[PDB]
């Protein structure tokens, strides 16, 4: 039938099956024709053949569309705008800040002497002094800075760097007196120290107060299998990693993930273990003034394991300030007296039953700054650290999200504000006795976009079960709600992750060029309406997430925001569960489905990298009761029979290698959709990357593919 067909051959094992315990059925035998695509790309010629053919296939179709180059050109022109973070004060008396003059692959880190900061981010360029330029590390600029910490003394700088197609990293150290030079040559990291810390999978680095070494988590030496045997080690500056002192290993629970935080004073070390993706921890305190660093430290329980999470907020001698959800699912601030360990935690800021606490931090010595969630947006609240009493709101006039910078010792914070409409304003705030000094420090501006052409509405719609759901709707002020407009509708729905007002230039360009609407339904699974909003979109209520999303699409059609024939949907990772399911359950509703790094096989996820931890969210597919509710929606196992559904056009983004979400999820589902719908009529494509990111070039190329694919699929014309 189709001009673009047939689909590339995809090989089948007609005999591959697994038998699962079922509470309703005793057991269920599930056949997996495409189980051989669980074998990594590097380790199988079949997985290679599949990746290479599906890749060539998607490319010829994406590149046959003139609008693909159109979109690449538009995006390049427009993304060429200056981007910067808030200034970040450090122990070497410098503000450090991230900058991008426009189309550099990675952010560079610049710094400026504290007191000279009003010379930076001018028409002239970033000013200050370049400290670190990631782009210089690799020739292709895919080598990425994954995190960094300055020593207490201000003389050392520990940083993580990923290589391109890998999510592992090494930790390096360089003197703060050894910055990168603008005129260094590509493909190398000059003024670094010998220290190399390999076999790290995440950057959780804590210096001791003496600046002589740092704690880090690492794994055993090196695909696809579950991540096992996370250990905490202490490294001393100057020594080879072979010398690093073991602090923690739990050989019995190899799936657990562990790390350590020091309090600001660097006196108390908090060990936290995670056994799943829930906000619960096994959690110990040691006094570093009372202990050699090693396996023979005097640990004491902060609390019974697996009831709560604990984040250090500050310390006052033997008193430690914690942000915790201990008997507070929406989180609170409580103190712990290491000198009275039996007394447990004392509430300093009570849980708000109608607002999720996002963060707490100490500024101007005794000002507690709280970020809460209300109406799927951030509110900043100031408290007296000592009494806990309210001292008022700051930035009440801004609706969006904040990133706060400033330490307890500074009377100053730098606050990055952003929203669907504001790309980033760095404000400066100075605390006073009763009231503070706010000023606008710097504001990102985009040439070739008039932000005043756009608007964001806040609507409420009922889901299937009658739950009122909040949605943001961003669109050109001058499109008619006459039921003809296309929609790009984006979802996550899980892990207590709130969809905040977020700036995306690409998104606003999509609204302008396609006279389109950008819909963000705050579906259950998120924290937007506190922790119970997550509980009503997980495990056996996971279906509520899909229901909330369908109902959003239906509200937009009913209220004339959108053509019923021009609904595009989009989701990543856990949002890939949402897209694939909604595609299976309501293919009628959707004209285009974009799945990124998608989680799709809800029976097999626990077997791959970090998937085992997702069992707290989806349920345990090897549990007979859980199997039943998981199996009803498992997108990979719920592709509709081909006779009487027309599948929407579908495009799947994935790399060939990926630690976070194993690409076998995409591989198998694509393979299966194509096998089940061999003649289309709308194409199911897999857009592959042969280096897992991410350079700005990769990102605009993906976006060009995405938008060109949506325009084609929904028969939209680009406008000028």
């Amino acid at each position: 039938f189709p001009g673009w067909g047939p689909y590339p051959p995809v090989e089948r094992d007609e005999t591959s099956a697994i038998t699962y315990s079922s509470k309703l059925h005793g057991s269920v035998t599930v056949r997996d024709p495409y189980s051989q695509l669980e074998v990594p790309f590097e380790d199988s010629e079949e997985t290679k053949a599949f990746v290479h053919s599906q890749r060539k296939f998607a490319r010829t179709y994406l590149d046959e569309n003139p609008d693909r180059e159109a979109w690449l050109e538009t995006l390049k022109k427009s993304w060429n705008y200056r981007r910067f973070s808030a200034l970040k004060p450090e122990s070497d008396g410098h503000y450090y800040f991230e900058y991008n003059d426009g189309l550099q692959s990675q952010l560079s880190l610049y710094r400026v002497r504290m007191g000279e900061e009003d010379t930076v981010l001018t028409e002239s360029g970033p000013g200050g002094e370049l400290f670190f330029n990631p782009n210089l590390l690799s020739l292709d600029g895919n080598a990425a800075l994954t995190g960094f910490v300055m020593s207490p003394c201000g003389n050392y700088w520990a940083y993580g760097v990923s290589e391109h197609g890998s999510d592992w990293m090494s930790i390096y150290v360089r003197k703060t007196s050894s910055p990168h030079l603008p005129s260094q040559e590509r493909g190398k990291d000059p003024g670094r120290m010998n220290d190399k810390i390999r076999h790290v999978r995440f950057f959780i680095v804590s210096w001791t107060s003496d600046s002589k070494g740092f704690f880090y988590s690492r794994y055993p030496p090196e695909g696809n299998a579950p991540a096992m045997n996370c250990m905490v080690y202490y490294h001393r500056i100057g020594e080879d990693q072979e010398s690093d002192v073991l602090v923690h290993e739990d050989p019995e629970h190899p799936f657990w993930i562990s790390s350590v935080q020091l309090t600001p004073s660097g006196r108390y070390i908090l060990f936290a273990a995670s056994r799943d993706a829930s906000h619960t921890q096994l959690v110990k305190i040691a006094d570093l003034h009372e202990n050699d660093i090693g396996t023979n430290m005097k640990w004491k329980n902060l609390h019974d394991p697996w009831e709560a999470r604990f984040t250090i907020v500050g310390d006052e001698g033997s008193k430690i300030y914690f942000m915790t959800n201990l008997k507070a699912k929406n989180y609170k601030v409580a103190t712990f007296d290491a000198n009275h360990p039996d007394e447990g935690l004392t509430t300093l800021i009570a849980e708000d039953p109608n607002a999720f606490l996002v963060s707490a931090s100490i500024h101007a010595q005794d000002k507690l700054l709280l970020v809460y969630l209300r109406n799927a947006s951030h509110e900043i609240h100031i408290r007296d650290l000592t009494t806990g009493k309210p001292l008022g709101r700051i930035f009440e006039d801004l609706l969006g999200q904040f990133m706060v910078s400033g330490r307890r010792q500074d009377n100053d914070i730098f606050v990055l504000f952003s929203s669907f409409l504001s790309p980033g304003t760095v404000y400066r705030y100075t605390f006073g006795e009763e009231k503070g000094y706010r000023s606008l420090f710097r504001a990102i501006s985009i040439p070739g976009l008039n932000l005043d052409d756009f608007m964001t509405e806040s609507v409420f719609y009922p889901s299937k079960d009658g739950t009122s759901v909040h949605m943001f709707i961003t669109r050109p002020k001058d499109v008619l709600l006459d039921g003809t407009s296309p929609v790009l509708q984006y979802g996550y729905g899980g892990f207590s992750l709130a969809m905040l007002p977020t700036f995306s230039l690409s998104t606003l360009l999509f609204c302008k060029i396609y006279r389109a609407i950008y819909a963000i339904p705050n579906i259950r699974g998120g924290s937007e309406y506190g922790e119970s909003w997550h509980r009503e979109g997980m495990l056996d209520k996971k279906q509520n997430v899909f229901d909330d999303f369908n109902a959003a699409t239906e509200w937009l059609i009913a209220n004339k925001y959108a053509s019923k024939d021009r609904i595009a949907i989009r989701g990543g990772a856990n949002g890939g569960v949402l897209t694939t399911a909604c595609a299976n359950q309501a293919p009628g509703l959707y004209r285009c489905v974009i799945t990124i790094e998608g989680i799709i096989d809800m029976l097999r996820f626990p077997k791959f990298t970090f998937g085992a931890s997702w069992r707290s969210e989806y349920g345990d597919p090897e549990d007979p009761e859980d199997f039943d509710f998981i199996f009803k929606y498992s997108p990979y196992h719920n592709i509709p029979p081909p006779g009487d559904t027309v599948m929407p056009a579908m495009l799947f983004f994935t790399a060939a290698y990926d630690d976070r979400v194993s690409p076998l999820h995409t591989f198998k589902h694509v393979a299966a959709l194509q096998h089940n719908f061999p003649k289309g009529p709308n194409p199911c494509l897999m857009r592959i990357d042969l280096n897992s990111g991410k350079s700005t070039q990769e990102m605009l190329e993906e976006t060009a593919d995405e938008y060109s694919f949506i325009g084609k699929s929904m028969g939209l014309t680009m406008q000028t």
Binding site: S259, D276, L497, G572, N574, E597, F610, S613, W614, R660
Partner: peptide
């Protein structure tokens, strides 16, 4: 701070 793509 555990692991969710």
């Amino acid at each position: 701070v555990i692991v969710v793509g």
